[PDB]
Design a protein around this ligand. Structure first.
Ligand SMILES: Nc1nc2c(ncn2[C@@H]2O[C@H](COP(=O)(O)OP(=O)(O)OP(=O)(O)O)[C@@H](O)[C@H]2O)c(=O)[nH]1
Ligand SMILES: Nc1nc2c(ncn2[C@@H]2O[C@H](COP(=O)(O)OP(=O)(O)OP(=O)(O)O)[C@@H](O)[C@H]2O)c(=O)[nH]1
Ligand SMILES: Nc1nc2c(ncn2[C@@H]2O[C@H](COP(=O)(O)OP(=O)(O)O)[C@@H](O)[C@H]2O)c(=O)[nH]1
Lengths: 429, 432, 432
């Protein structure tokens, strides 16, 4: 029960799952063929949440993959764990996005979505009891920006009660992947706050330095950067899938983390992080995990929690650890960092304790942050937005694909109406 | 021929109850498969063959913590018509505990409970074990407390409800689930016993010399209170006590039904030597504020009525000498209108220890119940948490958007303001 | 020396009867070849040597389901002069059941039946096992019900007829074959017991924990009713009951002869432990509306007269205590003119289980027969199906074109409108 349908979108949104589904299947002992090889009977206790049990004692990931070109979908099946997916779920267009939100939401998105919304519906009745949908995409490109959000508005009409969370990729502050990424951000951020219950923002630029300053990786490729994305997503649902002393799910991490229904942009963190030449000198204790999280260089977003206050904090723990070693540390980080939290929410620390550690470690954790430091993350987008839009830069491509200025003007001020909320709750009493 | 059935609501219902029913198995010779290779008619009905079953109704809205009983060591002990589960959990939401999900299976649990009463005649009361922080232990309890007063009514209900800690918080929505369940259970319940987490971590570090306990290790001490209140039913004692008597001996006013529990002695096995544990040594440890299981200092309040339960080697001349020294002190000060504030019970059999446990096999032990007035200071700070979180309208849309009128907070808060100053009325003395 | 022969009509006659006669073989020590390496004079006549035969008359208009007995495990048990078949089936057509094909071999089955009566003297009654949906179980039965009242008459006929399910339909022509057989059998039959498919799938999922049963698995529970009504004939009991008594104890008015059946307990083998199955626990499960084998809620109607059959370890003081608690309830409400509405029967021998079966060997079991009034609500919705399908003149040419006057529907429907409001006359109380 409580099954989750996994949906992907974009070139970034596909290769994450090739890393993501490699990690989840190795938490239950699954070959790339699709059979079972585990030793303990606990691994099949909640196996049905990411697996529809097929015939022949095989297992398939309840996953739907969406692109606008075949340049990625053939690359997934020709790698490791590309054999696990069902060949019917690869729904994709033929031409390509062209890195355009207008083509990603109006031109090709109107055609391909009917070949997806039946497949989601085909996985809807496959679920014995549906929990919610998770989405993996980006915000700078074309496919991950528009075609992701075009699914979200149709799903929320079909499922108002079901939860929704998107592991999006917020673009970096200084270096630029996409030239038109301020237009692709604001026109998609206007859609995220309409029909998503929570969002976990991940920056590329922070994940470069986490792999370099902490892991000391000489050549960090995407087979290692996307591994930290998978360690976050597996660290959230790890209480839904295993017995623990204090359970948690995607609903407990949604009610206790969102005070107001538009203030739901989060920041993830992971702990511990050991280098291959710096692991044999560390004391693996629970208070070592706590002080590693709350600094700047362990956040997975370009954010400064020193210039900001937290509102809600969720920590999900894995492994056979005690409670007084956890609960006393959660109190002490509120006392010494008393200016770093908010005043009108008393004791804003959420505790989640599981009993299955990650394979390869003994104890671990997963950090979920919610602070008003993301107001710099959106105003810097909004500063680049108002500079380009007043020059009508790159505007005729969107205008040529059926789009008016009032689409921009409402979406511009709605971000300004978003940040003005955060600054209002930042320094009140 | 007197029976008493138990209800376990939420995750705190399950993980307390498994350590509780483990202790009942080890006393009446019950194996983990029910056989015994009498006196246990109270909590264990008998089949046609020589196998017995517990009188348990385990219920939760999430299936994880139930299935550990369905596959664990106590697999073939419990009737599988009693492990009532559901699809989706309330997940810290009083609306999903009382208005959305709890509306479904509230008419399913009541079927099994009445079938337990059909094979009993001495049904004295109930045992409802839940928590205040979580939604399922608050919401699904609060709807259940209506239907029990509808159907049975006269049977003396009880609560070993987990009081929310004033400085150790797990969930953010504890100042909403604590307040909203208080407006409901005040109309129906009879006597709610409070056990708090924070004071147990104070005791188990200082008095058990264990600085790293778990919830399984905390539930071992909670089972000491459960076996020592229901001690006069199973075993016979020199001076017994009934479950109907607790709502008369400890409830002066019908709007105040909050006593608290205290257990003594709590010493480790290597420290079990070097002292004799005399009856006056183990009774001054009860009224000491450092040994209570609720972090509320009683010296800033008064005691309306106290209760003393004794089990082990107990001489009634020694208990009489133990009480009179306490009333001649000044750190304990009673309320002016109640000089006769003690209900003393004596049972012969000592508490036994679980193998692989933490406490030690002693000759005698005390479980003290007291109805203080200093707990209202914790109620003000709980309401002080509620004042800031509601005036900012925080987390409201998760409640109103799931079938809850927003004006219902105006009804619960004003009733809370009444009971906040009801301790002001009782706590002051009379005129001359 | 009291005998009772059985008739099995249609496919529902065969596949019920094979599971029924399997149970009779396993009780009297009967092997699958008749030998027994007394008391069974009722259902088993004896040859000149030491071989016995069943008193069965199997009949169907299609040869498929008969030949599985002719080649199956019970090959050398049944006399091959009793497996009367034909060339073409009726195939869901009351005209081909009563007017075209059934005219031929109605004078062939009556030859073998009278030869069974020639070797019997205590011929009490008949057993006619058929269905209402199919044509052969409706048409060939309705012509057979005339000739039995012509020839024998006084012998108390019975029906375990399959009532059509209100929400699970196999054939489209069920609202024609149900209504047209009701106009005919009302003139001839004595007591028609109803067992519906839809409620058995409700029980066998919920109470046997099997979510995927088959017709062979459904016929195992139907054989429990057959052995428990004919229990007072084969075995001896402390308080017996006769087949002549059922048409007197349960038929108040001659135009109403529709009771229904209920069996209890129905528990699986792994759930057969953990409870004692006391006589009051297994009797409140009978009058519970969730455990009936006909999906008709009796709490929206009344009971004219009830019947209780007991087999197993049965103490008559315990049955007396079990009945009086039921009449002091409110969910069961009888009709005002019948305070004495019970015919209680007790047999000693428990029901045995088939090897490879689904239920478990218990000490005692109950088969309840009750004559409700809430079944007329299902008759209105059955007629509500008949109103739309006949006013549109649907499927009429398959009936009129095979020897049936179209005005015969005007005769059956107006008689149905009489019996529809005959429950209105009885179901209301008197004046003051
Ligand atoms: N002493 C003790 N406290 C426990 C135990 N299990 C949980 N708790 C406490 O219970 C509280 C959490 O409430 P839960 O009972 O899990 O919540 P719930 O009512 O089931 O609500 P859901 O989220 O819907 O499951 C915290 O204060 C925990 O410390 C236990 O075994 N012992
Ligand atoms: N409970 C139960 N119902 C059965 C069984 N076999 C058939 N039925 C039901 O009988 C109905 C079909 O009627 P039939 O008896 O097959 O039809 P018929 O009267 O023989 O008519 P023909 O088509 O001429 O053979 C359906 O409602 C089936 O569910 C059985 O073994 N058990
Ligand atoms: N983490 C991560 N981000 C990537 C990767 N490849 C591209 N991105 C980011 O994804 C965004 C571009 O999206 P893209 O998938 O190319 O466009 P789309 O296919 O139209 O959705 C930019 O923010 C890139 O930094 C990758 O392998 N890993």
């Amino acid at each position: 029960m409580r099954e989750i349908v996994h949906i992907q979108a974009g070139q970034c949104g596909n290769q994450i799952g090739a890393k993501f589904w490699e990690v989840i299947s190795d938490e239950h002992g699954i070959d790339p063929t699709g059979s079972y090889h585990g030793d303990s009977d606990l691994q099949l206790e909640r196996i049905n949440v990411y697996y529809n049990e097929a015939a022949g004692n095989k297992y398939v990931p309840r996953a739907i993959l969406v692109d606008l070109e075949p340049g990625t979908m053939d690359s997934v099946r020709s790698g490791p764990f590309g054999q696990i997916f069902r060949p019917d779920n690869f729904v994709f267009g033929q031409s390509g996005a062209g890195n355009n939100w207008a083509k990603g939401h109006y031109t090709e998105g109107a055609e391909l979505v009917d070949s997806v919304l039946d497949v989601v519906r085909k996985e809807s009745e496959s679920c014995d009891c549906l929990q919610g949908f998770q989405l993996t995409h980006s915000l700078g490109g074309g496919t991950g920006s528009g075609m992701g959000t075009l699914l979200i508005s149709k799903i929320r009409e079909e499922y108002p009660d079901r939860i929704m969370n998107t592991f999006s990729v917020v673009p970096s502050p200084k270096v630029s992947d996409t030239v038109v990424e301020p237009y692709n951000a604001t026109l998609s951020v206007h859609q995220l706050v309409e029909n998503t219950d929570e969002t976990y923002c991940i920056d590329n630029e922070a994940l470069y330095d986490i792999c370099f300053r902490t892991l000391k990786l000489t050549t960090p490729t995407y087979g290692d950067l996307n591994h930290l994305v998978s360690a976050t997503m597996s660290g959230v649902t790890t209480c839904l899938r295993f017995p623990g002393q204090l359970n948690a799910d995607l609903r407990k991490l949604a009610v206790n983390m969102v005070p107001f229904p538009r203030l739901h942009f989060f920041m993830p963190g992971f702990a511990p992080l050991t280098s291959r030449g710096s692991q044999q000198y560390r004391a693996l204790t629970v208070p070592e995990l706590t002080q590693q999280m709350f600094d700047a260089k362990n956040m997975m977003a370009a954010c400064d929690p020193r210039h900001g206050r937290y509102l809600t904090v969720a920590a999900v723990f894995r492994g056979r650890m005690s409670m007084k070693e956890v609960d006393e540390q959660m109190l002490n980080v509120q006392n010494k960092n008393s200016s770093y939290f908010v005043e009108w929410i008393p004791n804003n620390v959420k505790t989640a304790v599981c009993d299955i550690p990650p394979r390869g470690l003994k104890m671990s954790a997963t950090f979920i942050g919610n602070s008003t430091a993301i107001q710099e993350l959106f105003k810097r987008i909004s500063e680049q937005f108002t500079a380009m839009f007043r020059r009508k830069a790159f505007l005729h491509w969107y205008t040529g694909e059926g789009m008016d200025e009032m689409e921009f003007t409402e979406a511009e001020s709605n971000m300004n109406d978003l940040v003005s909320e955060y600054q209002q709750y930042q320094d009140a009493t | 021929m007197r029976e008493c059935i138990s209800i376990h609501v939420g995750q705190a219902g399950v993980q307390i109850g498994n350590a509780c029913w483990e202790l009942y198995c080890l006393e009446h010779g019950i194996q983990p498969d029910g056989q015994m290779p009498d006196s246990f008619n109270t909590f264990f009905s008998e089949t046609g063959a020589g196998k017995h079953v517990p009188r348990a109704v385990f219920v939760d809205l999430e299936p994880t913590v139930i299935d550990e009983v369905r596959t664990g060591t106590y697999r073939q002990l419990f009737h599988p018509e009693q492990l009532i589960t559901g699809k989706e959990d309330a997940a810290n939401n009083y609306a999903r505990g009382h208005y959305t999900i709890g509306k479904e299976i509230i008419d399913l649990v009541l079927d099994r409970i009445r079938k337990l009463a059909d094979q009993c005649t001495g049904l004295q009361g109930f045992l409802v074990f839940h928590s205040f922080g979580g939604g399922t232990g608050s919401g699904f309890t609060s709807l259940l407390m209506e239907r029990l007063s509808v159907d049975y009514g006269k049977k003396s209900k009880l609560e070993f409800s987990i009081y929310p800690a004033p400085q150790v918080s797990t969930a953010v929505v504890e100042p909403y689930n604590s307040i909203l369940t208080t407006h409901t259970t005040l109309e129906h319940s009879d006597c709610a016993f409070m056990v708090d987490n924070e004071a147990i971590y104070d005791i188990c570090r200082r008095n058990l010399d264990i600085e790293r306990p778990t919830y399984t290790n905390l539930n071992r001490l909670i089972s000491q209170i459960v076996s020592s209140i229901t001690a006069s039913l199973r075993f016979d004692g020199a001076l017994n006590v009934d479950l109907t008597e607790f709502q008369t001996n400890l409830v002066p006013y019908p709007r105040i039904h909050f006593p608290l529990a205290t257990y003594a002695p709590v010493i480790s096995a290597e420290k079990a030597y070097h002292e004799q544990l005399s009856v006056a040594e183990i009774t001054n440890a009860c009224f000491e504020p450092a040994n209570q299981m609720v972090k509320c200092d009683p010296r800033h309040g008064k005691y309306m009525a106290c209760c003393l339960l004794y089990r082990g080697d107990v001489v009634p001349k020694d208990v009489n000498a133990a009480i009179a020294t306490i009333k001649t002190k000044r750190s304990i000060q009673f309320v002016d209108w109640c000089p006769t504030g003690f209900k003393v019970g004596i049972n012969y059999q000592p508490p036994t220890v679980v193998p692989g446990g933490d406490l030690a096999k002693v000759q005698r032990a005390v479980c003290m119940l007291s109805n203080t007035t200093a707990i209202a200071e914790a109620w003000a700070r709980l309401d002080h948490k509620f004042d800031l979180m509601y005036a900012k309208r925080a987390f409201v849309h998760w409640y109103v958007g799931e079938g809850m009128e927003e004006g219902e907070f105006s009804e619960a808060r004003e009733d809370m303001a009444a009971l906040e100053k009801d301790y002001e009325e009782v706590g002051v003395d009379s005129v001359e």
